[PDB]
């Protein structure tokens, strides 16, 4: 989720979670305009100042994860599995091979066709199981009459 | 049942998105309007059972069940961009360039801030916004004013009858905030301070990161109809998709209860 | 509601005022001691999507 | 979610910004010392689908995004204004004016006027940096090829020099940040300005009584408008057909 | 359920085809862009039963369709005049070389160059052109001939001074290049080892100054393909609907 | 499926399968502009070459 917000004191955040870059939780100047480079460098320009005063103020930390070694958590933040964590260290290293772009925001990835087919299959399987339940109950109920004398 | 609650939350989220889109489209003609955008967030996750041991001379899938909960609208952020300027030829209309907010005085005693440049003079000569609320610096224009002129800065002067040199009457200073996104928006094109946005600081235009004043121009709303139409189509399709889940859950529950 | 429309409005207004000053100059061509006028325009503000 | 809607939306946005810059270029065709603008686009990120020396890999695009907009700093035409205080730069260079706040702004549109104090100011109130002062009781003002400005007085034969018009040059002309009133300010993309007398170190000359006009090609602009209109309509059709397909899917 | 899976695969294939069609349509005004077309293929075939004159009486069930590749039509686009003095266009084959920030080298095709504050030649976006042509100050005029030589004139100079040469690279098979975003391509195993050459030699192209190469996108072709994709999608949805009807009736009875 | 492709070394491969003609499967130069005739002849022209 690339939607980054700025607090009153220049603290960056994402949904209330402070984003950490190279170092600790990065804090930009108080009320400066912020620009993101193509590889994670953060530039700040104090408003009203001449444009030749834009200065780098920090750098984001971007990690690369394959996808088959990351598990979701209760809050909704992916973390490494135990084996991948042991193999690659407790905390990942900011690889320089990842490049990003500003001005765009990525949405979700849910396939409507997959959702519809899954729903149809679930409904049909539920109906078949219900029919099986009915048949078994009827058979047992009629079989218990044998116990009489 | 959990499916109905989850689909109810989804339908509510889509309805709220449609509501903010409709609000954005409705006031496309309001002066100095900043378009909003609603951002959602998924709820917590319930873990029925945690994954066990894996990756032991095998290529098995992880056996971890983790159900979702739904979606809630977490925020509605406005885009404090710069809108276009339209000419009105009225000497009492001021357009603002950059950042800043004119400070008006609410009747109860507090103060609110606005960007809508549309000023009129009441019966006492005071400068008030369209609606009767007085401008906090309270610029007073005397009678028999041949022409009221406001420069690129906040200085305002008016020429008299005989005297050649115009007589200055006031300064239109404007306030700025550390984070303009956190302002609380109410009716009458008014923004008020919150805990999220820092304490306002006043400055004359052109200094301390403030804007500049253009006379006789009005800033228009920065709404994007191309974005709005596609958002409408997307939310309609998503609403239909979500309703399909309710329909299927109802059908399967009906088949169950016909047991 | 479109930036192109709100820019072409100002363009039309500028051309209209230029034609108006030309017509005013042409009107009183026989006036004794009259000095002709010419108009000078400037561009409006700019929106910076990405800081140069 | 649907694949093509957010691609067609980006296409519509790109065409909208293209039409915006075209309209901006057309609007100021009568202003002096203006430079036409061109926007340049680029594709967005691509997603690679992973497959089991293959000829190629499966890659899917995402859309288009306007990346930059440059100004064509060519030489415009010259129109004879018949005035005596209008200067047109032949070549490359910029006058240095000073904003009221104190900073410096560099412009090319030369149409000067004299304020009540006798100084030389541009149209708008800003005064030129070298602080050219024209004394009262002036018969005529002459500006040569160089920056020397001379004023002729009654009863004197030799004209008296009052100031010098040194004009600045930049290493990167396009990188200047443009604000209103045909003013530019220096940035990091543009080099540090360096002063120069006219005719030396690549600086241009000066013509008195002329104003440089804008280099806008209306013939190109009209065809660009036709192209952007057609592109916008095609993208709208793409949106419509995506909507139809998705509606047919969801009404299952 | 077999019908459901097959129809799901068909719908996904049509979705990807519509995606690439929309991608081609979107950047119709992007300099140095090449259209893409997607090619599909069938999956494995199940052999349920092995085989005077009668029909062979054999069963062989299909599985579905998958997308295999997206080939780019590396044709020649038209040239449009921008009247600028620092823009170049490729006539024929060949790609420029630029340096990414990390250190690797990526190739581009379009020509739209600015000059940074130092004086070096960079593309629109900050990426520095690999041959590193530097244009000093007081550059009255810049010339980039049909060959890679770049010559700048100065004040009161009888002859222009050369400030470098713009050699360009060529690939054995350009269709296999990986296309990362922002009008860039990076070498991969599919394409052969690139070889650089001066323009006009070893099959390379020629440089025209003041023109840019427009994308070769065929709008009529894309519209017809889009109509066909929509109709095929509508046809495929009927398979899911009929399978659903069959399953519902089976469950009911 | 008449969708032929050229690998880096110059082998006409369809869907990863080399094409077979008479006298050896196939062999083409590094980057020649292949032109396939009406009945099977495969003319090759080296780019840049006259």
mmCIF file of C-alpha atoms in Angstrom, chain B residues 16-196:
data_model
loop_
_atom_site.group_PDB
_atom_site.id
_atom_site.type_symbol
_atom_site.label_atom_id
_atom_site.label_comp_id
_atom_site.label_asym_id
_atom_site.label_seq_id
_atom_site.Cartn_x
_atom_site.Cartn_y
_atom_site.Cartn_z
ATOM 1 C CA UNK B 16 -20.008 4.957 0.862
ATOM 2 C CA UNK B 17 -17.673 5.092 -2.133
ATOM 3 C CA UNK B 18 -20.616 5.910 -4.397
ATOM 4 C CA UNK B 19 -21.703 8.576 -1.911
ATOM 5 C CA UNK B 20 -18.352 10.358 -1.980
ATOM 6 C CA UNK B 21 -18.222 10.097 -5.782
ATOM 7 C CA UNK B 22 -21.685 11.654 -6.035
ATOM 8 C CA UNK B 23 -20.661 14.432 -3.656
ATOM 9 C CA UNK B 24 -17.567 15.108 -5.768
ATOM 10 C CA UNK B 25 -19.641 15.303 -8.943
ATOM 11 C CA UNK B 26 -22.480 17.377 -7.477
ATOM 12 C CA UNK B 27 -20.495 20.472 -6.495
ATOM 13 C CA UNK B 28 -18.369 20.625 -9.643
ATOM 14 C CA UNK B 29 -19.199 24.347 -9.853
ATOM 15 C CA UNK B 30 -18.322 25.338 -6.278
ATOM 16 C CA UNK B 31 -15.462 27.825 -6.080
ATOM 17 C CA UNK B 32 -12.313 26.531 -4.417
ATOM 18 C CA UNK B 33 -13.492 22.944 -3.978
ATOM 19 C CA UNK B 34 -10.928 20.195 -3.370
ATOM 20 C CA UNK B 35 -12.003 16.747 -4.533
ATOM 21 C CA UNK B 36 -12.104 13.939 -1.983
ATOM 22 C CA UNK B 37 -11.081 10.308 -2.240
ATOM 23 C CA UNK B 38 -12.128 7.529 0.129
ATOM 24 C CA UNK B 39 -9.589 4.894 1.178
ATOM 25 C CA UNK B 40 -10.726 1.663 2.828
ATOM 26 C CA UNK B 41 -8.990 -0.962 4.946
ATOM 27 C CA UNK B 42 -9.521 -4.654 5.607
ATOM 28 C CA UNK B 43 -10.480 -5.711 9.124
ATOM 29 C CA UNK B 44 -8.694 -8.167 11.417
ATOM 30 C CA UNK B 45 -8.055 -11.807 10.546
ATOM 31 C CA UNK B 46 -9.317 -14.858 12.419
ATOM 32 C CA UNK B 47 -6.947 -17.839 12.491
ATOM 33 C CA UNK B 48 -8.877 -21.075 12.954
ATOM 34 C CA UNK B 49 -5.642 -23.067 13.213
ATOM 35 C CA UNK B 50 -1.969 -22.196 12.844
ATOM 36 C CA UNK B 51 0.293 -23.906 10.290
ATOM 37 C CA UNK B 52 2.192 -26.937 11.542
ATOM 38 C CA UNK B 53 5.444 -28.533 10.453
ATOM 39 C CA UNK B 54 6.301 -28.432 6.754
ATOM 40 C CA UNK B 55 9.200 -28.598 4.282
ATOM 41 C CA UNK B 56 10.509 -32.028 5.321
ATOM 42 C CA UNK B 57 11.469 -33.819 2.081
ATOM 43 C CA UNK B 58 8.052 -32.756 0.783
ATOM 44 C CA UNK B 59 6.379 -30.096 -1.355
ATOM 45 C CA UNK B 60 3.155 -29.807 0.630
ATOM 46 C CA UNK B 61 0.915 -26.771 0.862
ATOM 47 C CA UNK B 62 0.800 -24.968 4.227
ATOM 48 C CA UNK B 63 -2.235 -26.090 6.236
ATOM 49 C CA UNK B 64 -3.232 -22.739 7.670
ATOM 50 C CA UNK B 65 -6.823 -21.519 7.868
ATOM 51 C CA UNK B 66 -7.210 -17.748 8.231
ATOM 52 C CA UNK B 67 -10.604 -16.206 7.483
ATOM 53 C CA UNK B 68 -11.133 -12.541 6.703
ATOM 54 C CA UNK B 69 -13.566 -10.238 8.445
ATOM 55 C CA UNK B 70 -14.559 -7.546 5.964
ATOM 56 C CA UNK B 71 -13.744 -3.995 4.894
ATOM 57 C CA UNK B 72 -14.305 -0.615 6.518
ATOM 58 C CA UNK B 73 -13.753 2.913 5.180
ATOM 59 C CA UNK B 74 -10.682 4.102 7.045
ATOM 60 C CA UNK B 75 -10.265 7.636 5.696
ATOM 61 C CA UNK B 76 -11.405 10.265 3.206
ATOM 62 C CA UNK B 77 -8.456 12.381 2.085
ATOM 63 C CA UNK B 78 -8.937 15.565 0.076
ATOM 64 C CA UNK B 79 -6.539 16.620 -2.677
ATOM 65 C CA UNK B 80 -5.310 20.127 -1.819
ATOM 66 C CA UNK B 81 -4.043 20.659 -5.353
ATOM 67 C CA UNK B 82 -4.180 23.914 -7.328
ATOM 68 C CA UNK B 83 -7.306 24.527 -9.372
ATOM 69 C CA UNK B 84 -7.809 26.603 -12.480
ATOM 70 C CA UNK B 85 -8.605 30.318 -12.390
ATOM 71 C CA UNK B 86 -11.707 31.802 -14.007
ATOM 72 C CA UNK B 87 -12.098 35.508 -14.699
ATOM 73 C CA UNK B 88 -15.100 37.272 -13.195
ATOM 74 C CA UNK B 89 -14.207 40.975 -13.768
ATOM 75 C CA UNK B 90 -15.471 41.742 -10.236
ATOM 76 C CA UNK B 91 -13.032 43.835 -8.213
ATOM 77 C CA UNK B 92 -14.052 42.155 -4.928
ATOM 78 C CA UNK B 93 -13.076 38.599 -5.929
ATOM 79 C CA UNK B 94 -9.648 37.320 -4.882
ATOM 80 C CA UNK B 95 -7.955 34.151 -6.122
ATOM 81 C CA UNK B 96 -5.199 32.498 -4.095
ATOM 82 C CA UNK B 97 -2.062 30.942 -5.592
ATOM 83 C CA UNK B 98 -0.129 28.279 -3.711
ATOM 84 C CA UNK B 99 -1.141 27.609 -0.111
ATOM 85 C CA UNK B 100 -3.072 29.593 2.457
ATOM 86 C CA UNK B 101 -6.514 30.157 3.900
ATOM 87 C CA UNK B 102 -8.577 33.276 4.453
ATOM 88 C CA UNK B 103 -9.722 33.413 8.072
ATOM 89 C CA UNK B 104 -13.394 34.155 8.697
ATOM 90 C CA UNK B 105 -15.186 34.640 12.018
ATOM 91 C CA UNK B 106 -17.983 32.255 12.931
ATOM 92 C CA UNK B 107 -20.947 33.796 14.794
ATOM 93 C CA UNK B 108 -20.461 31.713 17.946
ATOM 94 C CA UNK B 109 -16.980 33.130 18.558
ATOM 95 C CA UNK B 110 -14.554 30.665 16.990
ATOM 96 C CA UNK B 111 -12.810 31.029 13.625
ATOM 97 C CA UNK B 112 -12.913 29.003 10.413
ATOM 98 C CA UNK B 113 -10.712 29.032 7.323
ATOM 99 C CA UNK B 114 -11.686 28.982 3.657
ATOM 100 C CA UNK B 115 -10.312 29.159 0.124
ATOM 101 C CA UNK B 116 -13.424 30.434 -1.692
ATOM 102 C CA UNK B 117 -12.619 33.889 -2.995
ATOM 103 C CA UNK B 118 -15.923 35.753 -3.209
ATOM 104 C CA UNK B 119 -16.204 38.893 -1.091
ATOM 105 C CA UNK B 120 -18.938 41.487 -0.643
ATOM 106 C CA UNK B 121 -19.338 44.611 1.482
ATOM 107 C CA UNK B 122 -22.115 44.725 4.073
ATOM 108 C CA UNK B 123 -23.985 47.819 5.269
ATOM 109 C CA UNK B 124 -21.222 48.926 7.662
ATOM 110 C CA UNK B 125 -18.453 48.976 5.048
ATOM 111 C CA UNK B 126 -16.809 45.854 6.458
ATOM 112 C CA UNK B 127 -15.634 43.127 4.095
ATOM 113 C CA UNK B 128 -17.598 39.904 4.592
ATOM 114 C CA UNK B 129 -17.828 36.608 2.762
ATOM 115 C CA UNK B 130 -20.913 35.617 0.789
ATOM 116 C CA UNK B 131 -23.116 34.675 3.724
ATOM 117 C CA UNK B 132 -22.530 37.522 6.158
ATOM 118 C CA UNK B 133 -19.565 36.115 8.086
ATOM 119 C CA UNK B 134 -16.913 38.775 8.648
ATOM 120 C CA UNK B 135 -13.330 38.377 7.489
ATOM 121 C CA UNK B 136 -11.184 38.105 10.608
ATOM 122 C CA UNK B 137 -8.656 40.863 9.724
ATOM 123 C CA UNK B 138 -11.789 42.995 9.105
ATOM 124 C CA UNK B 139 -10.761 45.115 6.134
ATOM 125 C CA UNK B 140 -12.896 48.268 6.109
ATOM 126 C CA UNK B 141 -13.586 50.045 2.812
ATOM 127 C CA UNK B 142 -14.733 53.672 3.237
ATOM 128 C CA UNK B 143 -17.688 55.199 1.450
ATOM 129 C CA UNK B 144 -17.495 56.906 -1.967
ATOM 130 C CA UNK B 145 -14.838 54.379 -2.996
ATOM 131 C CA UNK B 146 -14.071 55.057 -6.653
ATOM 132 C CA UNK B 147 -12.233 51.737 -7.011
ATOM 133 C CA UNK B 148 -10.940 49.127 -4.559
ATOM 134 C CA UNK B 149 -7.651 47.558 -5.645
ATOM 135 C CA UNK B 150 -5.802 44.633 -4.061
ATOM 136 C CA UNK B 151 -2.241 43.975 -5.166
ATOM 137 C CA UNK B 152 -0.375 40.718 -5.549
ATOM 138 C CA UNK B 153 0.370 41.064 -1.836
ATOM 139 C CA UNK B 154 -2.248 41.570 0.856
ATOM 140 C CA UNK B 155 -2.147 45.370 0.654
ATOM 141 C CA UNK B 156 -5.508 46.882 -0.279
ATOM 142 C CA UNK B 157 -5.987 50.542 -1.184
ATOM 143 C CA UNK B 158 -8.811 52.736 -2.465
ATOM 144 C CA UNK B 159 -8.634 55.996 -4.411
ATOM 145 C CA UNK B 160 -10.522 59.041 -3.159
ATOM 146 C CA UNK B 161 -12.143 61.845 -5.164
ATOM 147 C CA UNK B 162 -9.530 64.596 -5.293
ATOM 148 C CA UNK B 163 -6.344 63.188 -3.789
ATOM 149 C CA UNK B 164 -4.127 61.561 -6.408
ATOM 150 C CA UNK B 165 -2.287 59.193 -4.068
ATOM 151 C CA UNK B 166 -4.508 56.280 -2.967
ATOM 152 C CA UNK B 167 -5.009 55.748 0.758
ATOM 153 C CA UNK B 168 -4.110 52.313 2.106
ATOM 154 C CA UNK B 169 -6.799 50.647 4.213
ATOM 155 C CA UNK B 170 -5.465 47.250 5.313
ATOM 156 C CA UNK B 171 -3.604 44.022 4.658
ATOM 157 C CA UNK B 172 -5.120 40.654 3.718
ATOM 158 C CA UNK B 173 -2.888 38.248 5.589
ATOM 159 C CA UNK B 174 -3.680 34.549 5.286
ATOM 160 C CA UNK B 175 -3.033 31.504 7.443
ATOM 161 C CA UNK B 176 -1.189 28.280 6.671
ATOM 162 C CA UNK B 177 -1.113 24.848 8.283
ATOM 163 C CA UNK B 178 1.602 22.226 8.560
ATOM 164 C CA UNK B 179 -0.709 19.544 7.112
ATOM 165 C CA UNK B 180 -3.709 20.832 5.166
ATOM 166 C CA UNK B 181 -5.117 17.318 4.713
ATOM 167 C CA UNK B 182 -6.084 17.088 8.381
ATOM 168 C CA UNK B 183 -8.471 20.050 8.359
ATOM 169 C CA UNK B 184 -12.060 19.237 9.317
ATOM 170 C CA UNK B 185 -14.493 20.338 6.618
ATOM 171 C CA UNK B 186 -17.954 21.663 7.459
ATOM 172 C CA UNK B 187 -20.615 23.516 5.491
ATOM 173 C CA UNK B 188 -20.267 27.001 3.996
ATOM 174 C CA UNK B 189 -16.868 26.052 2.506
ATOM 175 C CA UNK B 190 -15.307 26.170 5.969
ATOM 176 C CA UNK B 191 -12.318 24.275 7.331
ATOM 177 C CA UNK B 192 -11.455 24.119 11.028
ATOM 178 C CA UNK B 193 -8.354 22.980 12.871
ATOM 179 C CA UNK B 194 -8.021 19.512 14.384
ATOM 180 C CA UNK B 195 -5.430 17.565 16.327
ATOM 181 C CA UNK B 196 -4.101 16.106 13.064
#
